[PDB]
Write a protein that binds this ligand. Structure first.
Ligand SMILES: O=S(=O)(Oc1cccc2ccccc12)[C@@H]1C[C@@H]2O[C@H]1C(c1ccc(O)cc1)=C2c1ccc(O)cc1
Ligand SMILES: O=S(=O)(Oc1cccc2ccccc12)[C@@H]1C[C@@H]2O[C@H]1C(c1ccc(O)cc1)=C2c1ccc(O)cc1
Lengths: 229, 10, 231, 10
């Protein structure tokens, strides 16, 4: 299935499978609390998890995996996928994290929560890095589905099929850069720069997960968080 | 079993 | 201006291979909880001294301020130890070659609570490099990338050195006969493994600076300072 | 006030 698509067909499938930008329950009057900001982030992420689950089903090659493998990949990478989406939404807003169209937070809002400002800065630095790189939406959807298939492929044959899909997404990335007028050296460099960022997204997820457990979470977030603890 | 397995198989 | 950018690809490879740290030996002597903790702690404590002198010989690293050098090493030191362990264990499937006189498998990681999970992840990485037929020239490029990349966001000079190492890796794969498609495919495969190596380091660091594991063993002051960096 | 400073300078 996924190995039969072309690069443009790959981009077309990923772009159409994009989840929507959900809104928050933020009341600008209601005073800021680290319980309210937590609840606000928690209610948003829990609703985003429903769209992410149905998004993963539309990722090429994901349905071919067993139900057990689909569970494992989403359990390991759900925060990574949420973060890179947040980072991508916040590109045009320097110094601000766009959790929702009605919820823009900067550094000091992250101070309202203990130990979250350091992760805010890493998210801001990642968003700034995408801004300087002029990251395209076709490249973002490629990176986000790479995270889905890669973040749990060594934590489980069936893993061999995933690597063939991963190579297919790499062909798709090179196809986009070559179409952007980049030279062969520029294509390889930009490809490397993009995948090195996933190492940082992994670092932010592991640190955020470490703060997440040792917890007002939802029943879905608890079952996702339990997979890391 | 899990809520995650629930939504994935629907 | 930095000298590392004026180097060629083969000059980059040559300098990286020449800076390689030696393969150290463990103490000579079944392992319990504390004995395996003491053996691995003593080995990693001695490797760190060779790693610091190895880092100074990574092209472009010396051009950093002394603070930037300290910060990169504090962030990536366990990642660098793991990719070395994973590299040494390539020829020994199912076994981790910590030292030439210290080969461990899964069951030996069982006498330390929580260490089996990361042994399994390390064994999977080593078997992954083995099935990819990872060459030494590729290994020294990945390890230096880990040194420069892992602490780059917590500036412009590091990224053009990372670009330089990327040119080197592609130059190695083209020299090996890989086609254009196989080149960027293999490049992506090696760089995605770095994400897993980062993951193992985070999960492994989490046990290290836990107050429980912190009080079982005489951790060296150097190992404590490297540990406190992940406050 | 840090061992890493000394080893990086020696
Ligand atoms: O790394 S975090 O900053 O998480 C934390 C970091 C540090 C302390 C924390 C304390 C409680 C909860 C989360 C903490 C994570 C990224 C972003 O901020 C957090 C967070 C989140 C917070 C609470 C949740 O229940 C779920 C997600 C984020 C988020 C949420 C949704 C998005 O679409 C994007 C990002
Ligand atoms: O990820 S670990 O397993 O981290 C741990 C370190 C210490 C205790 C742990 C307990 C349970 C699980 C993990 C633990 C780490 C990888 C490898 O095994 C550990 C470990 C180590 C142990 C003690 C230290 O003071 C420093 C390093 C390893 C190691 C040491 C040297 C190497 O060259 C390569 C790897």
């Amino acid at each position: 299935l996924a190995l039969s698509l072309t690069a443009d067909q790959m981009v077309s499938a990923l772009l159409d499978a994009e989840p929507p930008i959900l809104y928050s329950e933020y009341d600008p009057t209601r005073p800021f609390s680290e319980a309210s900001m937590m609840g606000l982030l928690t209610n948003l992420a829990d609703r985003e998890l429903v769209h992410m689950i149905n998004w993963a089903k539309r990722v090429p090659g994901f349905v071919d995996l067993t139900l057990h493998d689909q569970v494992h990949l989403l359990e390991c990478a759900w925060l990574e996928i949420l973060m890179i989406g947040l980072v991508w939404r916040s590109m045009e807003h320097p110094g601000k994290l766009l959790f929702a169209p009605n919820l823009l937070l900067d550094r000091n809002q992250g101070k309202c929560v203990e130990g979250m400002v350091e992760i805010f800065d890493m998210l801001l630095a990642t968003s700034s890095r995408f801004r300087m790189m002029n990251l395209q939406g076709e490249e973002f959807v490629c990176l986000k589905s790479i995270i889905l298939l890669n973040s749990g492929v060594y934590t489980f044959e069936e893993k061999d099929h995933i690597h063939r899909v991963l190579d297919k997404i790499t062909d798709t990335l090179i196809h986009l850069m070559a179409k952007a007028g980049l030279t062969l050296q520029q294509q390889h460099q930009r490809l490397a720069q993009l995948l090195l960022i996933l190492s940082h997204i992994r670092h932010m997820s592991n640190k955020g997960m470490e703060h997440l457990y040792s917890m007002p979470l939802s029943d879905l977030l608890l079952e996702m968080l339990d997979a890391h603890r | 079993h899990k809520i995650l397995h629930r939504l994935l198989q629907d």
